[PDB]
């Protein structure tokens, strides 16, 4: 019958973000997405303001075809890692996300621009890290307060981090708020931050006709 993909332990989002153990959903194509009720988070604790909306785009798109891009980030330390997101115990992070931190107490104002002139739509998923204390904010991103402002030709979005102590998840009180931005052909995107940017490593390919759907079941076909 149909082409069903089982998330098993990785949910629709953790597969898009690339949390540890979720490599098996990379390159996967499906018509229906089996979101098991037994799924668990396995990386840094996060939250998606429109979790139901973002979860919808991933399920409806019908494919996890990630495409790489090189952002020449300025002087920030790239490939950050934390012990709540261990893969093979390597302190790790989302394999689709890039955590940027200051190098020698110098986090510079960034300004990168990525253009789509192709024949597919691009899905940029990025985040904003919310430090727990103003000392943790400074130890990671020198400047205070933080700033993230991702823009297109028709959409300007600006996120201001909320510093504070949240409930303990994997023994951690900080959080990362994940957002998304869709860049249609002819449009472009502009990352601009002075701190707290959970930068992306690329974009997913979007189908112009999205016929897939999601399910939350119990067994394989």
């Amino acid at each position: 019958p149909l082409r069903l993909v089982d998330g098993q332990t990785c949910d629709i989002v953790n597969g898009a973000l690339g949390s540890p153990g979720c490599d098996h959903l990379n390159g996967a194509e499906w018509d229906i997405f089996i979101e098991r009720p037994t799924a668990v988070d396995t990386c840094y604790p996060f939250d998606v303001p429109d979790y139901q909306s973002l979860r919808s785009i991933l399920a409806n798109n019908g494919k996890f075809e990630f495409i790489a891009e090189e952002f020449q980030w300025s002087t920030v330390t790239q490939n950050g890692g934390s012990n709540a997101c261990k893969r093979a115990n390597v302190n790790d992070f989302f394999n689709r996300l890039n955590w940027l931190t200051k190098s020698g107490s110098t986090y510079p104002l960034q300004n990168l621009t990525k253009i789509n002139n192709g024949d597919y739509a691009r899905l940029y998923i990025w985040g904003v890290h919310h430090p727990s204390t103003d000392q943790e904010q400074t130890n990671l991103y020198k400047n205070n307060p933080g700033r993230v402002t991702v823009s297109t030709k028709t959409s300007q979005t600006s996120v201001v981090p909320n510093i504070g102590s949240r409930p303990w998840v994997r023994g951690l009180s900080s959080r990362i708020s994940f957002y998304w931005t869709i860049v249609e052909p002819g449009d472009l995107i502009v990352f601009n931050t002075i701190g707290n940017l959970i930068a992306p490593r690329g974009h997913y390919k979007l189908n112009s006709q999205k016929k897939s759907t999601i399910l939350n079941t119990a067994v394989p076909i």
Partner: antibody
Amino acid sequence: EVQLQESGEGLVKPGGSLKLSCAASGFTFSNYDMSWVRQTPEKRLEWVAYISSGGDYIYYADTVKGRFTISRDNARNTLYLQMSSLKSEDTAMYYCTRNYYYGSLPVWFAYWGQGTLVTVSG
Amino acid sequence: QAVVTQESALTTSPGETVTLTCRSSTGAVTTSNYANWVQEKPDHLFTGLIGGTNNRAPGVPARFSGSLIGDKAALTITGAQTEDEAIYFCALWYSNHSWVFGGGTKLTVLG
């Protein structure tokens, strides 16, 4: 399904020490966070301990900090609570706790154990 | 400070709609406080009802719903049955401290 049962009920005298245990089953114990919550005879609820899925991050309340020491043995699926320097006012039913994070935000203290009674007064 | 107060007891009848509240003494109740609702069935049977202010736990019937009423938290039972007769506890996470539990509301279905 998911199932927790406490054990170790007993009488201790003030100032002594008592160790509580929680036998976990129905889930991979090493991937989830655990806490201890108690209920005084006045039917009030009070949180007393927290431990990460790997035991790296442990936190207590001011009421028992320095006195209580929480631990877990992920290979046996057993949650422990080492109580010491006990006072009268620690008398409560001690519950095993755990949460459930799935639909967007999580639910703290979803799934409770049967609770085992500890009487501080000697 | 950091004292959570909720109703001492509430009474209702089958089929009616009831709302349980949970007020914070430190000020207003915010999404950031992460209101949690627990139900105590007799003989020390506890079951988590609502987490993250509004997210409904897996086994919870759909008639339960949690939301924010003004500066309080609120648990709404829409179409109460006699098996809703239990004590309902609240939990607010205060950054400073941690989870602090209210006095709990004892609900009685008159039947």
